[PDB]
Coordinates of C-alpha atoms in Angstrom, one line a residue:
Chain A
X10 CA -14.3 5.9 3.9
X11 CA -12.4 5.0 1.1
X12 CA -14.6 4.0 -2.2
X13 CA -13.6 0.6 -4.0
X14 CA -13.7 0.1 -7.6
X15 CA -13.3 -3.0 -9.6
X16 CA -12.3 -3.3 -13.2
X17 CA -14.0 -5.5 -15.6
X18 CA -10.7 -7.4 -16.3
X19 CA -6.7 -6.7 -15.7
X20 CA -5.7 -3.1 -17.1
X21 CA -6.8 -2.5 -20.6
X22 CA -6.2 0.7 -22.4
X23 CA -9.3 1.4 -22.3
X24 CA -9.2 1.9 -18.9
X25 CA -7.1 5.1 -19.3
X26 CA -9.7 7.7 -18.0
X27 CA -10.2 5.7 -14.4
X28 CA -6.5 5.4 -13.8
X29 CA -6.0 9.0 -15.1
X30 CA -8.5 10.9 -13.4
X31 CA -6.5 8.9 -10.2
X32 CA -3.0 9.9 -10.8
X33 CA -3.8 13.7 -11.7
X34 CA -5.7 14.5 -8.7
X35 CA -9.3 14.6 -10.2
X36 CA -10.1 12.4 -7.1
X37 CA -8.7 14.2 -5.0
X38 CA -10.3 17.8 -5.5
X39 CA -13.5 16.0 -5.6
X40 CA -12.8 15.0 -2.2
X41 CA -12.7 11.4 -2.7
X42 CA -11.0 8.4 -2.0
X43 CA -11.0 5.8 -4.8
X44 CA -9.1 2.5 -4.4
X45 CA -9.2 0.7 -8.0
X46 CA -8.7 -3.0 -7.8
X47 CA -8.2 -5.5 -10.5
X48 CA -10.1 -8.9 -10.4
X49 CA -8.2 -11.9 -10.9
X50 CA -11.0 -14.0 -12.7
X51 CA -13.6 -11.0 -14.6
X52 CA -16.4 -13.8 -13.7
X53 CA -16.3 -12.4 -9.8
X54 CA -17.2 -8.7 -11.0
X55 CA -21.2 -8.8 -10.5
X56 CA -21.1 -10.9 -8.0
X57 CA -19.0 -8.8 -6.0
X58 CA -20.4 -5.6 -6.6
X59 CA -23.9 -7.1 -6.6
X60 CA -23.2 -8.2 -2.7
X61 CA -21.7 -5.0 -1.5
X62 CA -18.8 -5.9 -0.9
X63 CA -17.4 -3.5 -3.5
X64 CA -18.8 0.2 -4.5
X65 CA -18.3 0.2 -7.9
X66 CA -16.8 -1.0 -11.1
X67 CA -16.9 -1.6 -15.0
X68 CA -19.1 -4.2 -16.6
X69 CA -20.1 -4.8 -19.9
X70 CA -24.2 -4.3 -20.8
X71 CA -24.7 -8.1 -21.2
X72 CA -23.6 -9.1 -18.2
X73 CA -25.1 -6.1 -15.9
X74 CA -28.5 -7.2 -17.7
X75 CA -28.3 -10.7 -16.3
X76 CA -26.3 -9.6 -12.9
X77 CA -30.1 -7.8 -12.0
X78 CA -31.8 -10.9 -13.7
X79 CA -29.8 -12.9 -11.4
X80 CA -30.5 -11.0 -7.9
X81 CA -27.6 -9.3 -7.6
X82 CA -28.8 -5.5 -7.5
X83 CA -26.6 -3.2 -9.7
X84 CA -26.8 0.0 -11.6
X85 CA -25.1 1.6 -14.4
X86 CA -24.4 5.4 -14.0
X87 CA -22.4 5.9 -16.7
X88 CA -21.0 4.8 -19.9
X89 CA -17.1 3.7 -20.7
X90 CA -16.9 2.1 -24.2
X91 CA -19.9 2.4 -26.2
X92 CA -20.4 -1.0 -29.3
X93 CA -17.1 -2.0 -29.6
X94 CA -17.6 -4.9 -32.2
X95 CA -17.9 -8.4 -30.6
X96 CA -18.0 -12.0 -32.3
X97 CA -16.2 -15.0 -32.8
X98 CA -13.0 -14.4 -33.8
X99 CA -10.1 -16.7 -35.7
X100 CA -7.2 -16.6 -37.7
X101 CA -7.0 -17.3 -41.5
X102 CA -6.1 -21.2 -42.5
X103 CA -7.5 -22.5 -39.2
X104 CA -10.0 -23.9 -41.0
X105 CA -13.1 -21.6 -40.6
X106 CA -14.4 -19.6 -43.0
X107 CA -17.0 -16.9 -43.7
X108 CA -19.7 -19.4 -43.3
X109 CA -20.8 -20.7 -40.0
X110 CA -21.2 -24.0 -41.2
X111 CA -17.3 -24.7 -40.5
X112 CA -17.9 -23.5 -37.4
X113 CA -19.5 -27.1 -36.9
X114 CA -17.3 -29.1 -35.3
X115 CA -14.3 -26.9 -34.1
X116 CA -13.7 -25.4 -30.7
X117 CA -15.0 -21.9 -29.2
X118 CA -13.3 -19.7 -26.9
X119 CA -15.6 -17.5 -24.5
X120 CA -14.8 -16.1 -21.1
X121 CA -16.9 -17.9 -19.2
X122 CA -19.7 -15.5 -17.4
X123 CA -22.5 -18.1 -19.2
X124 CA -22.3 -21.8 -18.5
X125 CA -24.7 -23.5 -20.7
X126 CA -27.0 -21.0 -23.4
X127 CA -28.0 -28.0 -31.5
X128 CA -25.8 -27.8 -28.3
X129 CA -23.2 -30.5 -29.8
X130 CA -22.1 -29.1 -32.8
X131 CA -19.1 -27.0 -31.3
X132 CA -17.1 -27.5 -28.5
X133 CA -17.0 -24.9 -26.0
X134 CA -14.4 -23.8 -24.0
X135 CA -13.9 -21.6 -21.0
X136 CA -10.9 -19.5 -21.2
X137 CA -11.3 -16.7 -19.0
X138 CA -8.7 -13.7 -19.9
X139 CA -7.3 -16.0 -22.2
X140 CA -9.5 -16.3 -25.3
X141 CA -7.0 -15.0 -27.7
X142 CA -3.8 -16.5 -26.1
X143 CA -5.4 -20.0 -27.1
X144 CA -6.5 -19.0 -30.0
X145 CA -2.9 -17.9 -31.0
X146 CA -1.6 -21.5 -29.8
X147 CA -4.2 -23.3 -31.2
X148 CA -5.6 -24.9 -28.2
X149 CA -9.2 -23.4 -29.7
X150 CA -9.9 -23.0 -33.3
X151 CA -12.3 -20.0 -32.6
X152 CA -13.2 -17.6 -29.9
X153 CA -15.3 -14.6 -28.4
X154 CA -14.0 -11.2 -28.2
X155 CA -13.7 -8.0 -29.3
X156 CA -12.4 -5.9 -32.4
X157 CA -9.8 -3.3 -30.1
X158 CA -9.0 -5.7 -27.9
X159 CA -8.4 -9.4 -28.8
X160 CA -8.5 -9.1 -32.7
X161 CA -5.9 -6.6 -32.0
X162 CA -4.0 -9.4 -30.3
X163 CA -4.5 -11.9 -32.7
X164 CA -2.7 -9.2 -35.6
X165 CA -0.1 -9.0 -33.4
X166 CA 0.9 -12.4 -33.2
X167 CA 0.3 -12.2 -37.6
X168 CA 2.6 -9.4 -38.0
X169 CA 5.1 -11.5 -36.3
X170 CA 4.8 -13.9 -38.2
X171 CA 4.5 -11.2 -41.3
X172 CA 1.1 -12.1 -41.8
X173 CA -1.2 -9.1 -43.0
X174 CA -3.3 -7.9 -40.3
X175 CA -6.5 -9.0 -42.3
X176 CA -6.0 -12.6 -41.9
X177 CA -7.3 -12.0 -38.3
X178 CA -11.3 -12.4 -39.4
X179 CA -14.5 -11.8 -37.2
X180 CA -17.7 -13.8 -37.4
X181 CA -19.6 -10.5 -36.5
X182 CA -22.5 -10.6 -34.3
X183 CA -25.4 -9.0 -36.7
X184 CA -27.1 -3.5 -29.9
X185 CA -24.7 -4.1 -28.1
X186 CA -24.0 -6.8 -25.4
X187 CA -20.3 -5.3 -24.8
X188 CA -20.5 -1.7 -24.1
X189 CA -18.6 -1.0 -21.1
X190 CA -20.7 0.4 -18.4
X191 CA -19.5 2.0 -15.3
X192 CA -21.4 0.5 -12.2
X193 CA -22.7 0.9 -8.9
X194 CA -24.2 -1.3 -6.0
X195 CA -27.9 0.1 -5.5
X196 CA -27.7 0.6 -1.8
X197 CA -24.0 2.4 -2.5
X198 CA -25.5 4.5 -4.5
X199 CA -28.7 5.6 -2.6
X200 CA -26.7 6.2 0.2
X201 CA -23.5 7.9 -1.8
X202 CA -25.6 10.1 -4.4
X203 CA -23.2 12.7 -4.5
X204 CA -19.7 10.7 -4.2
X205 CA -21.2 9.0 -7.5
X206 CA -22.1 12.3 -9.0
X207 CA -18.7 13.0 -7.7
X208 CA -17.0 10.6 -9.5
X209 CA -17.8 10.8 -12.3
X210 CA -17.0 14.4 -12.7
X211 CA -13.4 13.3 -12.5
X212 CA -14.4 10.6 -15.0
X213 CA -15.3 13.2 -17.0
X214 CA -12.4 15.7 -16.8
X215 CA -10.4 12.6 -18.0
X216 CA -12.1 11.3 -20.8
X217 CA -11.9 15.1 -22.0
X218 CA -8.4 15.2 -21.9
X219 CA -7.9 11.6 -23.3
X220 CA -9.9 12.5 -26.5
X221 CA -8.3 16.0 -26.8
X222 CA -4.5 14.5 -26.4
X223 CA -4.5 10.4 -26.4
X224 CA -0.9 11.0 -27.4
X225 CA 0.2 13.1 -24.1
X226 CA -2.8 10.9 -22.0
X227 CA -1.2 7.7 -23.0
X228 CA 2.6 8.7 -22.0
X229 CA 1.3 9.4 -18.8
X230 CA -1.2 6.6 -18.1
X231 CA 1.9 4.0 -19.1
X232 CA 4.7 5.6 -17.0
X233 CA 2.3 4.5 -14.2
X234 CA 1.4 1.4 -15.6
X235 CA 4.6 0.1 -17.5
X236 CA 3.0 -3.8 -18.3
X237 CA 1.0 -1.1 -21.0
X238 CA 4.3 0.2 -22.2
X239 CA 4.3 -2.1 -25.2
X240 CA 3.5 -1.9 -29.2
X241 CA 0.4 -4.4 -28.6
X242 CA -1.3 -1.8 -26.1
X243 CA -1.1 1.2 -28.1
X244 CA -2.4 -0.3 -31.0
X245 CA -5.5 -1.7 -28.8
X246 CA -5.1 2.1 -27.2
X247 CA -5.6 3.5 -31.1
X248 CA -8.5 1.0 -31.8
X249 CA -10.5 1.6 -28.1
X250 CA -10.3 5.6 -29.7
X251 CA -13.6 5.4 -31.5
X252 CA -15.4 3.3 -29.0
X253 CA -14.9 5.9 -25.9
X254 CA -18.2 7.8 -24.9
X255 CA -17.9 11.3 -25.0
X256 CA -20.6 12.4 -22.9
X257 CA -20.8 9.2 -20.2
X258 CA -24.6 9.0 -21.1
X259 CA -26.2 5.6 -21.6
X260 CA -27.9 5.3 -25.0
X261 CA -31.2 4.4 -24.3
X262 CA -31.9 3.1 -27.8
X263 CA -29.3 0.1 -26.7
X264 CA -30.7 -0.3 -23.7
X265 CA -34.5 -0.5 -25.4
X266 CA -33.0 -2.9 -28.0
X267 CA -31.0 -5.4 -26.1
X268 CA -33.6 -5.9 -23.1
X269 CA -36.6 -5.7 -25.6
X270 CA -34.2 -8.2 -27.6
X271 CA -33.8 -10.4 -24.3
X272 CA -38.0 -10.2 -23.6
X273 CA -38.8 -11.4 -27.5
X274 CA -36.7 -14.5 -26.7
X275 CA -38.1 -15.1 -23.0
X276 CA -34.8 -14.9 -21.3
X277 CA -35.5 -11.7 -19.4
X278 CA -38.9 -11.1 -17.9
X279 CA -41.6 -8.7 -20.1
X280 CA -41.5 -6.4 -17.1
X281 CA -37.7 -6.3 -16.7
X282 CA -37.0 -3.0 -16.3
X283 CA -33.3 -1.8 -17.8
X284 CA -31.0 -0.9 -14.5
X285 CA -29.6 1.9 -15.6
X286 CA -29.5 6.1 -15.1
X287 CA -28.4 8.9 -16.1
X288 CA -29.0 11.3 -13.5
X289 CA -25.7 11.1 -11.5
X290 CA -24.2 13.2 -14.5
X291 CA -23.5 16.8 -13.8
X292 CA -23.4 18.0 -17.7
X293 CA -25.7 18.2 -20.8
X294 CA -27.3 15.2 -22.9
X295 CA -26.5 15.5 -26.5
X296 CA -28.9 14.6 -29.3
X297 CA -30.2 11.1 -30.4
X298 CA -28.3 9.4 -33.4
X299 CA -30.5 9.8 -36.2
X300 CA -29.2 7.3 -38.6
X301 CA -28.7 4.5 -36.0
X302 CA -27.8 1.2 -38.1
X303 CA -26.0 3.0 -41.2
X304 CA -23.5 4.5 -38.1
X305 CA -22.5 1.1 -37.6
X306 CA -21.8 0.1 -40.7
X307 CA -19.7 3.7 -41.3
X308 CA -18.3 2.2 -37.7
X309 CA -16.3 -1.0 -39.6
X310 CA -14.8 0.8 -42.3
X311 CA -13.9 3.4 -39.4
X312 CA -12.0 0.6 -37.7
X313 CA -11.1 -0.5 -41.1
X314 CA -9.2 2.3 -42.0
X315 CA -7.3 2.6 -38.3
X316 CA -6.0 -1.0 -38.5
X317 CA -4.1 0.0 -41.7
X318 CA -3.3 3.8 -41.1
X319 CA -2.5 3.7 -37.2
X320 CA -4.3 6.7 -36.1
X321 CA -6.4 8.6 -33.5
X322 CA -10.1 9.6 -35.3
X323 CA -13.5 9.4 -33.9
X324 CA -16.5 8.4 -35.9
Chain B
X259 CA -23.2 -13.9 -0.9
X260 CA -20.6 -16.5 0.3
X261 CA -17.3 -15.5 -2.0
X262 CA -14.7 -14.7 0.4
X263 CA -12.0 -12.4 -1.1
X264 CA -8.1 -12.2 -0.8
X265 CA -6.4 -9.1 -2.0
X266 CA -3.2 -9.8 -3.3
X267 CA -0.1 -7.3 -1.6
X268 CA 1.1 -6.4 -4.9
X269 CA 0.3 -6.9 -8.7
X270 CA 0.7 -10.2 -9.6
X271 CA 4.5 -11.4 -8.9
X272 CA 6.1 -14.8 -8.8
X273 CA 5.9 -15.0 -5.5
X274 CA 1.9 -15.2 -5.6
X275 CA 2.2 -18.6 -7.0
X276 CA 0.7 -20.6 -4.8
X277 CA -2.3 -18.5 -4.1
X278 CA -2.9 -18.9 -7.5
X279 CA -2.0 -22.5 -8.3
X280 CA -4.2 -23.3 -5.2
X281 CA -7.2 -21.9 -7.2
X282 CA -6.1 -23.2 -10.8
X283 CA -6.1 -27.1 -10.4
X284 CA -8.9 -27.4 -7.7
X285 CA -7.6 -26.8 -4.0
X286 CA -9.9 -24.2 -3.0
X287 CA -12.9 -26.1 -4.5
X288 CA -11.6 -29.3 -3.1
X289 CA -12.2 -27.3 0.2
X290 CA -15.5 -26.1 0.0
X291 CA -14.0 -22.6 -0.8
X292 CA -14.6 -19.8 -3.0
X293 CA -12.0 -17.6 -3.4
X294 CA -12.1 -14.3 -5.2
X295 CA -8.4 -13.2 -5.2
X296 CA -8.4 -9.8 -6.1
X297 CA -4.9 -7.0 -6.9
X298 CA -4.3 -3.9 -6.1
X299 CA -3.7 -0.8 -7.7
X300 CA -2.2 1.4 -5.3
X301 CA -0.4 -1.0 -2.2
X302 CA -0.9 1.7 0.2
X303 CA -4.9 0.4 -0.3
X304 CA -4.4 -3.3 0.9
X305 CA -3.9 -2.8 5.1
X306 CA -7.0 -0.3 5.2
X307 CA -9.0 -2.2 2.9
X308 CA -8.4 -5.6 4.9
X309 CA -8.3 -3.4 8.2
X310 CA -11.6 -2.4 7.7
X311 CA -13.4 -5.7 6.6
X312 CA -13.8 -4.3 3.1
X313 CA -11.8 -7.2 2.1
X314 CA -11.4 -10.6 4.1
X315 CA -7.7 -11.8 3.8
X316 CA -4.8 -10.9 1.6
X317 CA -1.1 -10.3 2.1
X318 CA 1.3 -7.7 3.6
X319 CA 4.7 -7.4 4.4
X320 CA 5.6 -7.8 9.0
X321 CA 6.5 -3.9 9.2
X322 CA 2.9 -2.8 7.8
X323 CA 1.4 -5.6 9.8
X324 CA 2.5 -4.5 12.7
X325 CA 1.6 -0.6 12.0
X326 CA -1.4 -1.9 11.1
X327 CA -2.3 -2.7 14.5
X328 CA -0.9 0.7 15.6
X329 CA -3.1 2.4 13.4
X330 CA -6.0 1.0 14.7
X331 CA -6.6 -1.8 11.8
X332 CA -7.3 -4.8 13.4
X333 CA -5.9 -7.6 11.1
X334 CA -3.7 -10.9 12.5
X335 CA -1.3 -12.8 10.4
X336 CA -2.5 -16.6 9.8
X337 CA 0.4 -18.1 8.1
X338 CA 3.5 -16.9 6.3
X339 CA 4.4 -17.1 2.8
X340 CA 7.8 -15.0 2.1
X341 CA 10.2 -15.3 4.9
X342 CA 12.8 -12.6 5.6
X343 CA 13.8 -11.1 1.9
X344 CA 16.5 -9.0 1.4
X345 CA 15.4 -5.9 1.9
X346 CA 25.7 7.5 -4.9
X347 CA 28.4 6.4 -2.6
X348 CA 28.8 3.0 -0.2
X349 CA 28.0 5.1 2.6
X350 CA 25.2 8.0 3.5
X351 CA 24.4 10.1 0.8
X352 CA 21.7 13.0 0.7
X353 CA 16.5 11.5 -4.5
X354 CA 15.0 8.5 -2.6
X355 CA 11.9 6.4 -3.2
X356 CA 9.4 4.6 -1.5
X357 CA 5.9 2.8 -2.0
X358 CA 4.1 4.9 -0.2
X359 CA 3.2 3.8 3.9
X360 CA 14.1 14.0 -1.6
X361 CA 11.4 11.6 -0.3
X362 CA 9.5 10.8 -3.5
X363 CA 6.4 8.3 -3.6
X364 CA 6.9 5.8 -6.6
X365 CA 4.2 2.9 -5.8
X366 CA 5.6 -0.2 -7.3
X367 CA 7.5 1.7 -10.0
X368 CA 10.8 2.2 -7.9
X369 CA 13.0 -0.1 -9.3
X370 CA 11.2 1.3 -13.0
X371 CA 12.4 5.0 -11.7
X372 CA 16.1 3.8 -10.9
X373 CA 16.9 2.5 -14.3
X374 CA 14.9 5.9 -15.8
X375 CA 17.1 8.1 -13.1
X376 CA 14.2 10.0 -11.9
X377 CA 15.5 8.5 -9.1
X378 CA 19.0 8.1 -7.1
X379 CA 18.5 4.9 -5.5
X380 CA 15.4 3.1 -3.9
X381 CA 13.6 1.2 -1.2
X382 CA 12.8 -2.8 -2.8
X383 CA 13.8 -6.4 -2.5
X384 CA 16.7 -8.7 -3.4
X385 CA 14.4 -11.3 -5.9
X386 CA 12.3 -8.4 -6.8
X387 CA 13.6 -4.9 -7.4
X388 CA 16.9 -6.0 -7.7
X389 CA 16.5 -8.6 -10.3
X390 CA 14.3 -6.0 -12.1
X391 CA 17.5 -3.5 -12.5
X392 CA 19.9 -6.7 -13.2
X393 CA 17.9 -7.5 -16.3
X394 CA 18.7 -3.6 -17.3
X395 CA 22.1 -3.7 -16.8
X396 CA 22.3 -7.3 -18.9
X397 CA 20.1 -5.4 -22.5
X398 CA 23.3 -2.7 -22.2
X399 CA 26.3 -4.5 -21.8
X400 CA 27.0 -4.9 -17.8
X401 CA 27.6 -7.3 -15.4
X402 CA 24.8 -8.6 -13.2
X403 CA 26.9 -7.5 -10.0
X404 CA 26.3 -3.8 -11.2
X405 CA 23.0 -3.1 -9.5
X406 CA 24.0 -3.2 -5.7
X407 CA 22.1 -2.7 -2.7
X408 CA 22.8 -0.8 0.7
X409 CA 20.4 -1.8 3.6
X410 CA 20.8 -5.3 3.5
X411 CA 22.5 -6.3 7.0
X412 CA 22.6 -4.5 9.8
X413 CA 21.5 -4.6 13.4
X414 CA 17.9 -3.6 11.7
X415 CA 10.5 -6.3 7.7
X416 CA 9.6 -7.3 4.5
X417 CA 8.4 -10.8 5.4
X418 CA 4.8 -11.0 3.8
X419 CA 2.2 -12.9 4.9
X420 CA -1.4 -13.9 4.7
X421 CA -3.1 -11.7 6.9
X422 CA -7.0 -11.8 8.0
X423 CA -9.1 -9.1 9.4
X424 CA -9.7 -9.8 12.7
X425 CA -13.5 -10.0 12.7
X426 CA -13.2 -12.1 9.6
X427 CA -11.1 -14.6 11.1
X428 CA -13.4 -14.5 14.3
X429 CA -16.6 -15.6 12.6
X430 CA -15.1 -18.1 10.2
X431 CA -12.3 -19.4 11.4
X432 CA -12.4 -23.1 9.6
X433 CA -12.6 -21.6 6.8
X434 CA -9.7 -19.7 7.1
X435 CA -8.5 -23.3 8.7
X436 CA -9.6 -24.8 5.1
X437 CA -7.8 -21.9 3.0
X438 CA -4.3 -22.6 4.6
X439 CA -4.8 -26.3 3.7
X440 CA -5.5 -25.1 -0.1
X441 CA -2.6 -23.3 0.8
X442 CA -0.4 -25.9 1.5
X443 CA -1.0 -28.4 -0.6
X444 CA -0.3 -25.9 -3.7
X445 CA 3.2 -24.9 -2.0
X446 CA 4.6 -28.6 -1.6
X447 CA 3.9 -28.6 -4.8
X448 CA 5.6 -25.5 -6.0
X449 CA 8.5 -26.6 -3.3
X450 CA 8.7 -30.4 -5.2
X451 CA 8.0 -29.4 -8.8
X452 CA 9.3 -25.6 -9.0
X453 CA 9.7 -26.1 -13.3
X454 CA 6.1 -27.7 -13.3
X455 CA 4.9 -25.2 -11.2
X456 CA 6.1 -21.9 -12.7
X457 CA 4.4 -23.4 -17.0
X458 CA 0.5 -23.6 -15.5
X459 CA 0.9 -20.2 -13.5
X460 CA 2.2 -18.4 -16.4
X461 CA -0.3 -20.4 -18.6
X462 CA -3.1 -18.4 -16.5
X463 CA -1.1 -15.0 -15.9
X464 CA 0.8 -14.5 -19.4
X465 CA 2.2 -11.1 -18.1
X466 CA 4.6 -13.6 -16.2
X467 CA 5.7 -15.0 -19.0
X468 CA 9.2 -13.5 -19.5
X469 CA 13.0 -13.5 -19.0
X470 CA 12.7 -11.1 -15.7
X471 CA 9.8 -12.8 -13.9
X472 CA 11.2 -16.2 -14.3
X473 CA 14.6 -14.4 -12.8
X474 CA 12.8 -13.6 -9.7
X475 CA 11.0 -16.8 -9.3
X476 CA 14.4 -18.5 -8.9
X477 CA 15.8 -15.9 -6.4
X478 CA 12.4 -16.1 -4.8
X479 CA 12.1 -20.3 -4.5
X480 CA 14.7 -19.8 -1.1
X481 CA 12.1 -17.2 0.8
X482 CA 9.8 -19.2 0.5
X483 CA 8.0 -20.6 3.6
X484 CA 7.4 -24.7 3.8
X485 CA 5.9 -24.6 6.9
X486 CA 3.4 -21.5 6.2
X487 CA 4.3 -20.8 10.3
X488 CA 5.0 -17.5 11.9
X489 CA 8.6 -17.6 13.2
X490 CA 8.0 -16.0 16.6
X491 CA 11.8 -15.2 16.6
X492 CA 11.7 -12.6 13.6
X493 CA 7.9 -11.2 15.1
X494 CA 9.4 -10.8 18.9
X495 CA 12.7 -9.1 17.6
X496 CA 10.4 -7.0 15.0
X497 CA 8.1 -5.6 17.7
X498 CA 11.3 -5.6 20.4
X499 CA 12.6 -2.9 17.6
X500 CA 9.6 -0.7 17.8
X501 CA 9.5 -1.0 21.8
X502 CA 12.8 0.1 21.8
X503 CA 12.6 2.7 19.5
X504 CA 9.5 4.4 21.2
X505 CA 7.7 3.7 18.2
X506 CA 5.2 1.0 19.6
X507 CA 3.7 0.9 22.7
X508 CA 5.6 -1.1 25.1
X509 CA 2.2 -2.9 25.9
X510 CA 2.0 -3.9 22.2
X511 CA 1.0 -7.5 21.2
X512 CA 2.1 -9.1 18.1
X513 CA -0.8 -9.5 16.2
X514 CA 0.1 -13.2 14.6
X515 CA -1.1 -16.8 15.6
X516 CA 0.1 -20.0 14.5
X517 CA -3.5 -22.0 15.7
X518 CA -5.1 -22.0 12.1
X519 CA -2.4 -24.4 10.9
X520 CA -3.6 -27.7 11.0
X521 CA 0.3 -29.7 10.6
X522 CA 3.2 -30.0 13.0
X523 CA 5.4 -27.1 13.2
X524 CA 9.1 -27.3 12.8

């Protein structure tokens, strides 16, 4: 009876509530077993927990759109990182610019979930974990990722060089494709309603205390996991800060734009319907967000102002 | 679906290299395989996890393998891919860690909680935990020979190998027969080309990429297995311990085979 759990990718900080909630017992007094396993290549995720042959995990909205689209049943009962902001990343003097047209004829980092989606302008390669590694080395000239994670990775590599942390750019997409969704496999679910409501209680505790003391959270998260304990981490760990969902809901305005996005360009059905729920959550919804696009422009000057400063501050 | 899924025994060491390096240039695919090679969080996970059929195949150490068994977790060991590491005073002293299957749990942190002194000593390896404290000792001044070990030889484990669960192996056993193969092919490699070996596996796992892990890879080239075979020798002596020691029964079976080898054996 133990429950199985598979990350989206190799330990992030980000991850810090799931691994917390473990090592502090929240598990426990919910009376459950959790055994959190780390995939080796982030493309086996859906696939795995699509078949059954894990409970649960993290995946990113994107890809749990297209894992349903793609007959492998899954559901999203909660909500890890909400818009983090995605796009193609590079480094200053590469040669790409703020235009897209020097994006014509250079190389592309992506992970690798998609395959084939003017298709020989760029050159596109698959780079798994690795997007910002090569990116760094110069294997590719460009790459996909995201703004607390691998641009944070690319200014560390500048200020080691003593470049300024701005001269790791974005190409900004504009949502959004990469919020990290906790997951279930359908049949676990129908059959484990109230381990999954259980769950995420201890989720929950977590996140609480994460957002209330990162500081204190963080000490403890790396003392168990020590290939964190680095200045690289925490500075992800300080940029992940803003993106963590308070409340574990799914927005259901992203949900509605991203599917109604995907039907308007006839990739998803126009009766897909969106696979997720919030009713394994044990807690109150808050309110809608009233100024929905002008938050995410308050959002980049946010993360702005913590890639300078080095702080903990929610939007 | 078809993926069939290995959990690794440990987080990614440099020991592992084959596994991976058997994925990374093609073996596996070259086989008709897919391989999903997953890690663990918590060790303690892997034996119930493979035990129950959760997960197909992966690796553990002989001593769990064999309690395994004797807890009623029916996995076998197919082939062998560590053999026979190394596992205040000289003498007894009453503190002490272990993984987790005075008595303090540290998961695979003891050798972390030794050079933090939350801990006196610990339970680890000679090209693992030992080489982990060695690179301490070296950032402060001392000599390599300052981290020393008690344990090591006496008239009484930690061989790890590539286990199945039972039913698993029973319903696709060529495909476990193709997987070795894979297997193989990526150690003679590692074996004839350790250097070459060691720059695409850290390529792919960049947490490798360091001082310490390269350390242990070089302690760790003598462990490992050519032959991928079970050495009925360290299994019957093993098992003739826990018979002796009332611990097994004295009906108990050693649950390896060597049949899923597909090359002479030495």
């Amino acid at each position: 009876d133990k429950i199985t759990f598979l990350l989206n990718w190799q330990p992030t900080p980000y991850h810090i509530p799931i691994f917390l909630a473990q090592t502090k017992g929240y598990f426990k007094e919910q009376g459950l077993d959790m055994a959190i396993l780390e995939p080796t290549n982030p493309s086996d995720v859906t696939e795995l927990i699509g078949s059954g042959k894990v409970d649960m995990g993290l995946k990113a909205m994107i890809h749990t759109l297209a894992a349903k689209a793609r007959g492998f049943p899954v559901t999203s009962v909660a909500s890890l990182l909400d818009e983090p902001f995605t796009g193609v990343l590079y480094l200053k003097g590469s040669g790409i610019t703020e235009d897209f047209q020097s994006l014509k004829g250079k190389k592309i980092g992506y992970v690798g979930e998609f395959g084939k989606i003017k298709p020989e302008d760029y050159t596109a390669v698959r780079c798994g974990m690795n997007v910002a590694k090569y990116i760094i080395e110069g294997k590719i000239d460009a790459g996909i990722g995201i703004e607390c994670m691998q641009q944070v990775e690319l200014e560390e590599y500048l200020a080691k060089q003593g470049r300024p942390a701005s001269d790791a750019k974005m190409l900004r997409i504009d949502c959004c494709f990469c919020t990290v969704l906790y997951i279930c496999n359908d049949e676990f679910l129908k059959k484990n309603p109230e381990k999954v409501r259980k769950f995420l209680k201890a989720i929950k505790k977590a996140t609480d205390y994460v957002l209330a003391d990162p500081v204190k959270a963080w000490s403890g998260y790396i003392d168990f996991k020590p290939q964190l304990n680095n200045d690289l981490s925490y500075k992800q760990y300080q940029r992940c800060y803003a993106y963590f969902s308070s409340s574990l809901y799914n927005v259901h305005r992203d949900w509605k734009k991203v599917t109604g996005y995907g039907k308007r360009l006839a990739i998803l059905p126009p009766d897909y319907v969106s696979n997720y729920t919030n009713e394994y959550l044990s807690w109150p919804e808050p309110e809608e967000v009233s100024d929905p696009l002008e938050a995410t422009r308050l959002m980049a000057i946010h993360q702005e102002k913590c890639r300078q400063e080095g702080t903990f501050k929610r939007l």
